[PDB]
Write a structure and sequence with these properties.
Its cofactor is Mg(2+). This protein is an alpha+beta fold. Helices cover 37% and strands 18% of the residues. Bound molecules: the ligand CN1CCC(Oc2ccc3ncn(-c4cc(OCc5ccccc5C(F)(F)F)c(C(N)=O)s4)c3c2)CC1 and chloride ion (2 copies).
Length: 251
Amino acid sequence: SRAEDYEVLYTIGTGSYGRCQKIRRKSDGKILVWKELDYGSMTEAEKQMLVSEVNLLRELKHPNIVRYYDRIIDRTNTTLYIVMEYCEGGDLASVITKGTKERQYLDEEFVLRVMTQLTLALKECHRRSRDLKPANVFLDGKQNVKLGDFFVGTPYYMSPEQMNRNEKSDIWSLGCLLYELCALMPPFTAFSQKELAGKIREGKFRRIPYRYSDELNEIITRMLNLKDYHRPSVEEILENPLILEHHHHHH
Ligand SMILES: CN1CCC(Oc2ccc3ncn(-c4cc(OCc5ccccc5C(F)(F)F)c(C(N)=O)s4)c3c2)CC1
Ligand SMILES: [Cl-]
Ligand SMILES: [Cl-]
């Protein structure tokens, strides 16, 4: 828990909340990442909210949730580093964008992996009481899938009930994510939120591509039911004949 315990290899990403960098723990050479945050302009109130969230971040331990490792305060530069698991396969948004640009659909086997492992990640969250967007879902080097923590944008995954302001709402969002993985587009698209909301209320969308099994289409379609109580629970999802041991995480 000193910055000197790690060596930065290079920057992975930049943007709103400082930099994300790939680092190496000196003690044992383990490859990790950290988020570099400048809290210099923060009030005591804001810094307080920051402390509480980092504390909860330490609470979640699960193979399908991105693991938190450490927090380092550098009062000299008013920077806080949050050290997390490195996921070499990157995020799901990059995977979809890649597929969209290259014109190549993802394997059914890969979609089943994401369905199985994200459903389990969700199952864990629901127990505790965290958006299920592709940019927040990561892949490691071993076919494992991990859920990360985290106005202009279009709310593609907004559920019907949320639209008119529920664990079943999470199932809808999972539905949209799995749909987009298969179709390389969200089930409901629009140019404005008003248009989007109209489509969501009608609850109609294209079947996922024919390369995908009727069984997989069926379960995704069920998650996209207008009525929250017709959507399958995490338990009912995991009971599906499609889902097998090899779709689960492996060390
Ligand atoms: C090409 N482009 C694809 C995505 C990549 O970002 C990575 C790569 C490896 C990672 N190992 C753990 N993380 C986590 C990053 C994060 O928030 C930041 C983030 C989210 C989504 C896309 C990019 C980033 C970026 F800032 F790193 F760029 C996590 C969370 N909040 O739990 S976990 C990786 C992110 C590489 C660049
Ligand atoms: Cl295509
Ligand atoms: Cl396939």
